[PDB]
């Protein structure tokens, strides 16, 4: 019991994260033990308060062209619908990776924690931006050749196929891959185009 809170959140958690280990297969993902909701709480997470006056109502300011359940929602059946019609995606493999930001009602009182989960969900800035911003030294960046040396020679070694695809793609910007932006392409303050 409280598994009722967790059936409403086997709906909504599941919003994080049970099928997430997609193409990199079948990981040790989000757990059913209730304390672990706060490991799903990792850094990159801001959630504005309930009678927000509005950073939460800004989600009404776009609401119209997103929702499912309009007494006012986006359910399981709406990222296991909407992302296929709004931001990205999922194989049964990556199913509730992205659909793990709604396996259960994104009510307005959950739009709250979906632009919350936008500035949160997938390993956000403190993880992604800092993956290389911590290898980095300062008001800086990381060297191209040294990052080639990494991707192949450091850790789980990758293929030629993997390097070439991530080479033509790499934002090489002055002999150095603009790491902060290779990650935060996904973030800042000037776009209202994708995800939502």
């Amino acid at each position: 019991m409280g598994d009722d809170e967790k059936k409403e959140k086997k709906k909504k958690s599941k919003k994080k994260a049970e099928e997430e280990g997609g193409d990199a297969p079948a990981a040790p993902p989000a757990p059913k033990p209730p304390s672990q909701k706060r490991r799903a709480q990792r850094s990159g997470s801001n959630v504005f308060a309930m009678f927000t006056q509005h950073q939460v109502q800004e989600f009404k300011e776009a609401f119209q062209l997103i929702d499912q359940d309009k007494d006012g929602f986006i359910s399981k059946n709406d990222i296991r619908a909407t992302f296929d019609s709004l931001g990205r995606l999922c194989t049964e493999q990556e199913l509730d990776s992205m659909v793990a930001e709604a396996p259960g009602p994104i009510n307005f009182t959950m739009f709250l924690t979906i632009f919350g989960d936008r500035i949160a969900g997938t390993d956000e800035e403190d993880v992604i931006v800092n993956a290389f911003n911590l290898f980095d030294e300062g008001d800086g960046k990381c060297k191209e050749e040294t990052l080639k040396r990494s991707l192949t020679t450091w850790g789980e070694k990758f293929s030629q196929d993997e390097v070439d695809q991530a080479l033509s793609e790499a934002p090489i910007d002055g002999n150095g891959l603009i790491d902060i932006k290779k990650f935060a392409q996904i973030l800042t303050k000037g776009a209202k185009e994708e995800g939502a």
């Binding site: 994260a17 049970e18 997430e20 280990g21 079948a26 990981a27 757990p31 033990p33």
Partner: protein, 49 residues
């Protein structure tokens, strides 16, 4: 799928008849309840209640 497996002893009197009989089972998939993998489920009954 099931996950359990078993044994019997059969004690006999002076004349050899069935008198004692002793069944034992060995081990279980006893672990998942507090860790289910993505797209897996738990022990049957929870979801039912």
């Amino acid at each position: 799928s099931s996950r359990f497996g078993k044994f019997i002893r059969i004690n006999f009197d002076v004349t050899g008849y069935i008198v004692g009989a002793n069944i034992e089972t060995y081990l279980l998939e006893k672990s998942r309840a507090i860790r289910q993998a993505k797209d897996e489920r738990t022990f049957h009954i929870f979801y039912y209640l």
